[PDB]
Write a protein that binds this ligand. Structure first.
Ligand SMILES: c1ccc2c(c1)CCC2
Ligand SMILES: c1ccc2c(c1)CCC2
Ligand SMILES: c1ccc2c(c1)CCC2
Ligand code: FES
Ligand code: FES
Ligand code: FES
Ligand SMILES: [Fe+3]
Ligand SMILES: [Fe+3]
Ligand SMILES: [Fe+3]
Lengths: 192, 446, 446, 446, 192, 192
């Protein structure tokens, strides 16, 4: 990719493509698929503590941004381009997990139903840190509650995973640039 | 429905017909008597500081372009081309000297003037009177310490007068702190609630906090945490409630400067607010310096709300009777260290943004209360706001407005709905004033 | 539209304006004159048998809580908090001594009484009159052999009188069989049809079965299977149709005890019903014992339908003129072996549930017939229900009501729509009665 | 709103209230005064050439079956069963001698007659008057050179008279070319625009092309490409605009026979049209032979549009005030080589079909202009169509109708909206005629 | 997972997780993916007889339930928790297939269009029965008909597959707990 | 499949099934998955020129049809059964790419957001041409723009891929029979 020619492509997106187009290891894509499928399973059954214990690194940054709509030709206005829907460290994720599990979280009765669909998995080891695994994947997340409320979320996830305690690979960074500017899902209270 | 006669809000604001949260004809009527008549939040200086900077904003269901002029003023215009009515600007923010329509290419200035028309000489000759074809301008645009509001009605009171007695409470944080900045961009989420449901909640609802937010209080560790699950009532003198002639009101929780912020920010914030309070004692007196570092849950009538100290800033943009587009910004004090501003902004979104765990506690409450307003057996039912009635005062020597000297009550609901009913039944500002000449007496009866 | 004058249903129920399935203003009018006035199905004893057991149910577009009281009675209340109108109960069934609101924590008893208000002493003192703040109660709640119906109108006839001549046909299965149980939970699906489309279909439409359900008849092997693709008309004396003063009606297909159930259940069912019929001959006479084991397709006016023997039990819950939420339960005879009850319940859902292959045959029919009622050229067009007109009787020595002595006809449509029109044009029960004083004469003309 | 008095379109068609693109009550009124009154496009001979061939089509929000009769004529009927109102035909095209309803099996002929009723003898005896139960027939069905239009109003002018002065411009391509074929099936897409937004755009909007379609012009290489980004105005005498009494109008771009077609088709097309033009000079004269191979952007009032030469054929089917179902066909000349017809049809869809890159340039323009018509501050605002006013003529020696002798202007908007306003304020054709007796004088004022 | 700590997790869901977190065989996940992709292809083209012949075991239980919404803290009300939208043996599936293929099934003209998206495939052999293969997968099912009717279904499927005639692996149990309580899809007349 | 027995199955669909049910090469399905995931990534970041250069063969036919709704029993009416929403050669794709990248394409400001989900990948080498790879896959395509516009597309794709310049496998045919007759997505201006 040459972003002078491919006018619509951001520098960041071009950087990320480069990471996967190079060395391709089929075995790594396999491991990555297993890792994400198991993570999604834990989340779907609302095993949030198990998710934290098995899938989330102590040094995690879990970030979902919402980017302000600007002109494609904009080059002068330079104020904050995005806000953080999520920008959580491990302790902040733990707070959210406790909020989910609290028996006075009235919104969780009757019990919610989650179904996640993970696709387009790509994996590549980092150049500098041979212990850092880059994983890209897309998610459709279906949340149903209270008879007729149905919210479907769509996103691409840029992850970094690294082996932690026990040699278990855990999430150390997730970055999502949420594609819908105005949410039509009541909230974004789901772990993408 | 005859809005001149229909009692939608009972005397003294004691109850409201449940239909007000569900009736689409009333929603349409509110577009005229509420949103086209009153002051509505647009933006902050901090978001359009330089000439040419602009944002888009909603005013009711209308969309406007809000632009910093070369002379330093701000003007606002309908985001609608004067030719065949296409939406002029499709982005949320930027910098430009003008706006060109993507349909036939008419070019408008940042000042709203029709500046250019493609091939004007060949097509229109000298017959197009561009002077009469400027964008439809918002009649009134005023600032409250950097916070910019607009009003379509030239007859409105000045913004400062419109804030009435609420202004006195806002000034320590908005003015005497050295000034606030609004941190954008805002989160934006649609909820299936009437705009009045969150507006009333922020204006005067401390009662709900311990129960609605039990889980958020328990897991977050904020300073209001003792309230979780109604385990503990705040002590006497923990706060007060106020309301005003034009409907704005707020609750005051004394000393609650770290607000809803989780334990990770509490020490830093309590130190910062306390230090500034010590300086302010000498400038504005002990009571007002204390108010500066006290948590205010406020609605600026009709649909702009905030939690000072927590730093939550909300616009409840109306879509229809059961649909509202929620905009959430963070407010920070200009003289806070930049790293603290950044963490405060993230914390505002963490608690009250699109994935705000506090705000989520409120969803079912506001959505179902609104949607029940459409149900046949509930339309004519009475929503109650009588808590604390008969104990409110007016003209107090220390705290202005109609005031309930207790942290938890429904004083601010009553003032909000008194003003709402006065507007809905009136055709213009003069009629509102006539309907409001005994406003505080009505609120303090019994 | 003037509902006092507008002829929506022609004399003798012979035709109806197609707009009735599409007009939203009429739908709103039906909320008042149909749903707030008449008896609506709530639940069965079998679903709330113990003190504290409750379910939620719709009554029109309203939602109610239906609760077994300590004294063994059942009371029903609007599912709406008396404070700020939040929905009280968010689940479909359970057991509780009370319901606490998640907004400000008001606690209501199973008897609807406001029992507790958080911090009442500190906040309200002695000023809150909790005695006047009980949940809004459904005025009338009555039982027909365990089947519980509600009515918002205190002026309604007793449920038994309201069933009129239909009761005689229902009693052998509902009473003399030893009693029925309703098997929950129900299937729940939204269809894009007016509630009247399925109501009319179940009340009196045998004509459609051979053609609409050709594929289900052919592939399922049920006892009505000879009808597939209109290959064979039922013989003379294969059944009859009836209707009643308050609009309820049904078709009777003699001996069809295994109903729509596929061949896998036919021998067991035909044995069971036949054996019970032999016992009932001695108790209620041959004709009524035969009716017990005969397939009844019935609508209990306005929006509750059933297929006895097949065991299908339906509520057509209205949402708007082209939207209906279909609830499907199974009915079984209490003294059936448990394994047979289980297989019967599954078979009811297999044929008529959310994935019911029979029910699916009906979708396009009911959805398009309803949606066409909105189309400009069809609004004022006449839906026909004249089949069998001029051959109905009243006051027969054996079969009561207005009766057509043939299996296939539109007798029950005419009685359904006669009652519908009488309600839509009336302001109260007294006016309905005045409009209905010659009801059977009107139906048996010519 | 009082449609007899309300000025929705100002004198001479100079402006229109923006609400016309958003008001649902007006949309409902248009169903009566526009769609049930005027000629609407159904199909082409080429799509139903043989006896028994049929298609379904919309007429306003109604759906009709359009069928080739055995005698070679075409009749059209509401797609609604005369029994209980189910939709008769669920497919878009086919061949059949009749249509059987899937509800109770009533069988209707291709001629609309009720031919069979299942078990009629046993059920209805001799009492069913099938002669009175034929499908509701479209009163008027006429052809313009193979293009079939329908009208529900028996009082309408003949289709040829209704086309008025527009017919003269259409004839060289529709008649003298040897005839056109419509290539189906059409693309079908829903857009969130009022039907009038695309109708007005195709009837008279050349001004938008260079700017709206800048990207399509630049990347496609079509013959109109010089216009991209308003880089170049067409020369004087590049074309003209016309309008007519009953609202139809068009723009004429001289010689533009390859139209929007990308460079890959330009030489072949310019050769083909030029060759036919040379033959036509001798038959219809130089001016009309030139018109044959000139690009016409036309709307046949109310909601049928086309680009001749480009071969784009559109129906803007109304759904509600902000929803339109766009049908896109290709038109080709019968005597073109088959391979060229195929490539032309694909190119029509490539540019203006569901994934038409030209048509996509228009989406935001038409959707936002329509949706802004609902916004409170814009409802009473004036959409402008004054370009070229005061320079139009009538009764020209060469070019008939109200004509602006320039390629770019708003002549055709004015005539479109003059006719629209005359219909909206009239109860029947006689009233339209009375309201239109000085139609050309009104358009050529000043 | 410890369901005393992970308060939102059902005993059943915790049991199912345990099955896959243990022995992981990449080859088995491969076979499972092929099996489900081929099944979905047969269903999508409406080859219902071929589906029965090639994919469905004679001993099949094909079950989809709809669970009544109850309080998260409910512990006294013990009546039937769910109903069966489907609970079919082979003969009952055959009845439904014949109903689909019948030329008088008016709802099938014009022909329906199905598109299925299968993701999150997991596979593990049973402990006791070394011939029983557990497969878990999620489905998005898109059904389009009659111009503008569009229904999208979302579900997790707990399958058991076993080798049958010819050594071909066939479905012997499918269990779906449908996540939406009130269907907004006109019906559930699709094979999930 | 026997289409005399399986009444709902088209001859074309039966032909396509036959292609994959036979020889199964796990490695080929792997390569196909990589190929489609990379293509979808390039498209999602709007690297349209890179897509043409790396993914699209010079001899490509890129076709999406919309089929007219006809009676299942129809056998006499024989006019054009479908129209082409797309039927593009390489030059025509290039025109569409230039239209996307043009700075006067007003609809592309603010920048669109695309997310693609590719599933159900199947691959088989052609019988006659050992250099022609048949790939089948399903796509969910999510397009978000302008705050609250959200369009979701669903389709099955029948592809042929062949090695081109550099030995890189490129798309030489894509065929989609779009399953919704009337589009409810404003347009079909997306590369499926
Ligand atoms: C105190 C603290 C938080 C909140 C209020 C009052 C009203 C809304 C949210
Ligand atoms: C007999 C058998 C089945 C049904 C009826 C009559 C009416 C609806 C369904
Ligand atoms: C010339 C060329 C193209 C078009 C027009 C005029 C009106 C709509 C599209
Ligand atoms: S609509 Fe804006 S220039 Fe025409
Ligand atoms: S709304 Fe129920 S306690 Fe306030
Ligand atoms: S509705 Fe058509 S035959 Fe009855
Ligand atoms: Fe709250
Ligand atoms: Fe039926
Ligand atoms: Fe255009």
């Amino acid at each position: 990719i040459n972003i002078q020619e491919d006018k619509l492509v951001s520098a960041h997106d071009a950087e990320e493509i480069l990471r996967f187009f190079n060395c391709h290891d089929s075995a790594l894509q396999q491991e990555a698929t297993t890792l994400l499928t198991q993570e999604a399973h834990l989340l779907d059954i609302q095993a949030y503590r198990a998710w934290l214990e098995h899938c989330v690194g102590s040094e995690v940054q879990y970030q979902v941004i919402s980017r302000e709509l600007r002109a494609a030709s904009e080059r002068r206005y330079k104020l904050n381009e995005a806000m953080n829907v999520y920008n959580e460290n491990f302790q902040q994720l733990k707070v959210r997990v406790e909020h989910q599990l609290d028996p006075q979280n009235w919104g969780n009765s009757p019990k919610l139903r989650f179904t996640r669909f993970i696709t387009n998995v790509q994996a590549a080891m980092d150049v500098n840190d041979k212990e850092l695994l880059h994983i890209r994947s897309n998610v459709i997340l279906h949340r149903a509650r209270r008879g007729n409320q149905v919210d479907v979320f769509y996103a691409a996830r840029e992850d970094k995973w690294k082996r932690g305690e026990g040699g278990v690979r855990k999430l150390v960074q997730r970055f999502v640039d949420y594609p819908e500017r105005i949410l039509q899902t009541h909230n974004l209270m789901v772990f993408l | 429905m005859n809005y001149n006669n229909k009692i939608l809000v009972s005397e003294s604001g004691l109850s409201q017909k449940h239909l007000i949260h569900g009736d689409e004809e009333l929603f349409q009527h509110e577009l005229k008597t509420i949103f086209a008549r009153n002051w509505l939040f647009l933006t902050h200086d901090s978001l359009i500081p330089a000439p040419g900077d602009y944002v888009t904003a909603k005013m009711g269901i209308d969309e406007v372009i809000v632009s910093r002029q070369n002379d330093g003023s701000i003007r606002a215009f309908l985001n609608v081309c004067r030719h065949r009515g296409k939406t002029l600007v499709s982005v949320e923010a930027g910098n430009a000297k003008g706006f060109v329509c993507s349909y036939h290419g008419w070019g408008f200035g940042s000042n709203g003037e029709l500046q250019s028309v493609p091939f004007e000489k060949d097509l229109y000759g000298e017959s197009l009177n561009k002077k009469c074809l400027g964008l439809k301008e918002v009649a009134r645009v005023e600032s409250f310490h950097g916070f910019i509001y607009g009003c379509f009605d030239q007859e409105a009171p000045p913004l400062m007068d419109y804030l009435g007695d609420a202004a006195w409470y806002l000034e320590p944080m908005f003015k005497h702190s050295g000034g606030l900045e609004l941190v954008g961009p805002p989160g934006k989420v649609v909820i299936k609630a009437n705009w009045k449901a969150p507006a009333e909640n922020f204006v005067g609802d401390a009662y709900h906090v311990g129960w609605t937010h039990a889980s958020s209080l328990r897991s977050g560790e904020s300073i209001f945490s003792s309230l979780a699950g109604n385990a503990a009532l705040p002590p006497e003198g923990a706060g007060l409630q106020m309301t005003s002639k034009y409907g704005s009101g707020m609750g005051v929780l004394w000393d609650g400067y770290s607000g809803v912020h989780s334990a990770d920010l509490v020490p830093e914030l309590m130190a910062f607010g306390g230090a500034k309070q010590e300086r302010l004692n000498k400038e504005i007196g002990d009571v007002r310096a204390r108010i500066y570092r006290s948590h205010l849950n406020c609605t600026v009538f009709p649909n702009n709300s905030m939690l000072t100290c927590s730093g939550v800033f909300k616009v409840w943009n109306p879509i229809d009777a059961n649909t509202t587009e929620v905009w959430t910004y963070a407010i920070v004090e200009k003289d806070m260290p930049e790293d603290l501003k950044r963490r405060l902004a993230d914390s505002v979104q963490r608690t009250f943004g699109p994935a705000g765990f506090w705000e989520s506690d409120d969803n079912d409450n506001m959505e179902t209360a609104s949607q029940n307003g459409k149900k046949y057996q509930s339309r004519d039912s009475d929503l109650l706001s009588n808590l604390g009635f008969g104990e409110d005062v007016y003209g107090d020597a220390v705290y202005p407005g109609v005031v309930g000297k207790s942290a938890i009550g429904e004083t601010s609901y009553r003032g909000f709905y008194r003003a709402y009913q006065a507007h809905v039944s009136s055709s213009n500002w003069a009629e509102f004033e006539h309907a409001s000449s005994t406003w505080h007496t009505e609120l303090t009866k019994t």
